[PDB]
């Protein structure tokens, strides 16, 4: 897609992830685990909520009858009414089709972008203590226990702490 993450460098989604839209899977000496990222998840939901608030809506214009249901209307004015109504309907049918196709394209790419923005803030946090694998993961060149993995998710991972250890393992 536009931002290259969802249906891109991320191979697929996680059906097991049910408490969030975006999140982390780690593995270290202690084992493995999973956790959802709140802000990126909520950022995407809020934009769709706003999109729904705008679209799921009707005009408050009060329209009235111009065709009698239970009697004949003049043949001249009736063909005018029909042609007008059909013209209006083709416009709204077109306008509705375009609205939803456009909004759907934007929704997909917008969600694609929030995945990338999450990936990018992690890259910048890790700094020179890790390397990208091309599949969405970061191979960390130091022992990173469950409390270290928490701090990457919590956005308080200080790269300075592990920098010396990490640079040596990367160079080897």
């Amino acid at each position: 897609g536009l931002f290259g993450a969802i249906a891109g460098f991320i191979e697929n989604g996680w059906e097991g992830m049910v408490d969030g839209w975006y999140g982390f899977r780690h593995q270290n000496a202690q084992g493995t685990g999973q956790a959802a990222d709140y802000k990126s998840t909520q950022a995407a939901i809020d934009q769709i909520t706003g999109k729904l608030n705008r679209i799921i809506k009707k005009t408050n214009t009060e329209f009235e009858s111009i065709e009698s249901e239970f009697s004949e209307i003049d043949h001249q004015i009736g063909n005018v009414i029909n042609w007008t109504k059909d013209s209006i309907t083709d416009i709204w049918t077109y306008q509705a089709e375009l609205l939803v196709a456009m909004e759907n394209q934007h929704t997909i790419d917008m969600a694609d972008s929030e995945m990338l923005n999450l990936y990018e803030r992690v890259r910048k946090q890790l700094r020179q203590n890790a390397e990208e694998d091309g599949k969405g993961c970061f191979e960390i060149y130091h022992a990173c226990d469950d409390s270290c993995m928490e701090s990457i998710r919590n956005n308080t991972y200080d790269h300075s702490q592990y920098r010396e250890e990490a640079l040596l393992n990367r160079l080897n």
Binding site: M17, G20, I56, E64, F70, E97
Partner: protein, 311 residues
Amino acid sequence: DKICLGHHAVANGTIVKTLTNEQEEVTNATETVESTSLNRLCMKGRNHKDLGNCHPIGMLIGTPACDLHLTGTWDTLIERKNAIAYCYPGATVNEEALRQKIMESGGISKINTGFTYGSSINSAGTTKACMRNGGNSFYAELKWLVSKNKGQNFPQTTNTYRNADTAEHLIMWGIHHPSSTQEKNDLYGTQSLSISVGSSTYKNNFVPVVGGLSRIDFHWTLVQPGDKITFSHNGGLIAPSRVSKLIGRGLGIQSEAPIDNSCESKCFWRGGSINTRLPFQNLSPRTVGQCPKYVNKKSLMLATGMRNVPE
């Protein structure tokens, strides 16, 4: 050690259209075109009037069918199929404009015209066509004027109604066209019949014509505040006894569907109510009130999530 970034998915995803792709699969979607209708008129929160067998024009002239609907107020007015406007054979000029004008109103009040006629005029003439209380009667808001002594000339009479209200009044009248020359002379005499109606905003002349009950064609006009309208006649006029004031505004609905006071709606059509929140609708092009817009479309799915990429 490793930390992997990723996104959710679902086993069963939903197909939507984009600018690029017909068959795009996403985690969740929602409908924008409503397909279902309630088979009833949702009248909760509406002071409504169901006319039933009464036709809107009939409540101005006052057929027997419209005796309960001669006056009242409403925000919504429901007209039904085969409703009766006329007991005695007739046709109103600009029928549809008058009907729609009544169906735009939010009530009717009636005002006495006060018209008085000489001793040689019989104003209480009835017919077996307009039956009321199991007896011969006539349109409640009109009077059939005839010569009291059969065969005598109807006298040249002048009746003038002034609008003393601050709002316009709707006044109707009929013109009896007799079937045969015998009837014409028995009712109005052998003279030339000349009916003339006139105000500031209206002026016309009517000459009855000869040629199994006969016709009564109806006419109408508005009379502005402070203006007079004057009838000059010598036989043939079906004169009003009262005029109508159409009060405020309301929603006219034409539908055979039953009323339900438990549901609410702002949009109606022939087959019932459309009380969806959705922006679009494929039920009918003919609707009234505050409606979703009609579209030539069965479904149109808005995506409410990312691409679904399972494995």
